[PDB]
Amino acid sequence: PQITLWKRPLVTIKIGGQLKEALLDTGADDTVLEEMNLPGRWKPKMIGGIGGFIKVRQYDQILIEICGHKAIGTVLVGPTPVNVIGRNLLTQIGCTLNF
């Protein structure tokens, strides 16, 4: 689809078999989701944003469907203000910026 930006580009995602709403975020290198349960192993990591750094759990090679498009990649879980889909997954679904 072509998504205009008068509203937040929020979309439905499927991860761990569960539906969620997430923000398509071209300013995020990484995908960061709010606290949730995911199966498999994870590693503790740090990630920094506009206000400083937070502790996240890093899940690698996670299946996630974004607005009907499949991706498999790294998902960070932690106290982010909102679920964000970052460039690591936006590239996989073929998302580009156009003006």
Ligand X SMILES: CCC(CC)CN(C[C@@H](O)[C@H](Cc1ccccc1)NC(=O)O[C@H]1CO[C@H]2OCC[C@H]21)S(=O)(=O)c1ccc(OC)cc1
Q: For its own copies, give the closer residue by CB, 40 or 48.
A: 48
Q: Which of 11, 2, 28, 4 is nearest to 68 (CA)?
A: 11
C-beta of 27: minimal distance to ligand X in Å?
Answer: 2
Q: Is 25 a catalytic residue?
A: yes
Residues at the site binding its own copies, with contacts judged by CB under 8 A: 1-6, 8-9, 23-29, 32, 47-54, 67, 69, 80-82, 84, 87, 90-91, 93-99
> Could you give the CA distance from residue 42 to residue 7 in angstroms, rounded to a whole number?
34
User: Which one of the listed residues 25, 29, 30, 60 is annotated catalytic?
Assistant: 25
